[PDB]
Amino acid sequence: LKSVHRWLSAADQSEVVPGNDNIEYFSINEHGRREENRLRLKTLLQQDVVHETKTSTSAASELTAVVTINDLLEACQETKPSISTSELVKLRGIYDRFQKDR
Amino acid sequence: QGLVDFTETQLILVNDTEQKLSALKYANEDEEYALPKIGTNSALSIDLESLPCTISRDLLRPAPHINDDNSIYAFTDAE
Numbered sequence: 001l002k003s004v005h006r007w008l009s010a011a012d013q014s015e016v017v018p019g020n021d022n023i024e025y026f027s028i029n030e031h032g033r034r035e036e037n038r039l040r041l042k043t044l045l046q047q048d049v050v051h052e053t054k055t056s057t058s059a060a061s062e063l064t065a066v067v068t069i070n071d072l073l074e075a076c077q078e079t080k081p082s083i084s085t086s087e088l089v090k091l092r093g094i095y096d097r098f099q100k101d102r
Numbered sequence: 103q104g105l106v107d108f109t110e111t112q113l114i115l116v117n118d119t120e121q122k123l124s125a126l127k128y129a130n131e132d133e134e135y136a137l138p139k140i141g142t143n144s145a146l147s148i149d150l151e152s153l154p155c156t157i158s159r160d161l162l163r164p165a166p167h168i169n170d171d172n173s174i175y176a177f178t179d180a181e
Contacts, residue, residue: 030116037112044116 003071007063022050135181148181 012018023046033041058064083091139145159165162177 026119028117028119031114040112040114043114047120047122 002074003065003067006068006071007066021053023047148178 028044030044031040157175157177162175
């Protein structure tokens, strides 16, 4: 998910809603936003509902994991070792004593 | 719907940047329709289309007094 963040959250999604095709944004310039009242903006509705649209879910160009060595550097900075030597000092005995010994 | 207060109403400009108004029409024909066939015993190229609903005895302008004469009661425009 850290590696995904450098592909999904950084830049565009942190700055704008990216998108293409369909009704889209337009410079409607119909009237001043707040002159007669504080609520003139977006009073008018959109022109039509979308029929359909087609686009691939993932590619090497977009939305893929784009893994890097420095993401693994961050991952290993966030190490969580499953056990510690305070157990292995006991478990090592339990290991070696299991054979040749009983 | 209602009255407009010309002293204090929102009179909102909108620009038809998409020329949607050009799709609007008041049913008026621009020209006489193609190839009238008057005097022919038969006519063609007009379809048949199921009613969206039933229509009353009252809504037809002709309404001759016969107790049972017209139940099939089909209709078509001036074409």
